[PDB]
Amino acid sequence: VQLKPGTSVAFSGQFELLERANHKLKLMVPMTLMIIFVLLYLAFRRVGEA
Amino acid sequence: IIRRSVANRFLVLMGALFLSIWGTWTIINTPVDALPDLS
Segment (H or E) for A8 = none
A4: phi then psi, degrees, rounded to nearest 5: -90, 145
Chain A to chain B Cβ contacts (< 8 Å)? 9
How far is the CA of A43 from the CAs of A37, A40, A49, in angstroms? 11, 7, 10
Is A31 at the interface with chain B, CB within 8 A?
yes
Q: Do B14 and A31 touch (CB under 8 A)?
A: no
> Cα A50 to chain center, whole Å?
24
Is A44 at the interface with chain B, CB within 8 A?
no
CA-based torsion, B23, B25, B27, B32: positive or negative: negative
Question: Which method, experimentally, gave rise to this model?
Answer: cryo-EM
Segment (H or E) for B11 = helix B9-28
Q: What 3-state class would DSSP assign to A3?
A: coil
Q: Would you say A31 and B18 are in contact if contact means Cβ atoms under 8 Å apart?
A: yes
Q: What angle do CA B11, B30, B36 make, to 5 degrees?
A: 135
Kindly list the residues from chain B whose CB atom is less than 8 angstroms away from the CB atom of residue A44: none
Expressed in Å, this structure's resolution amounts to: 3.4
For the stretch B10-33, what's the b/e string if a residue is b when 16 or more beta carbons lie within 10 angstroms of its beta carbon?
eeeebeeeeeeeeeeeeeeeeeee
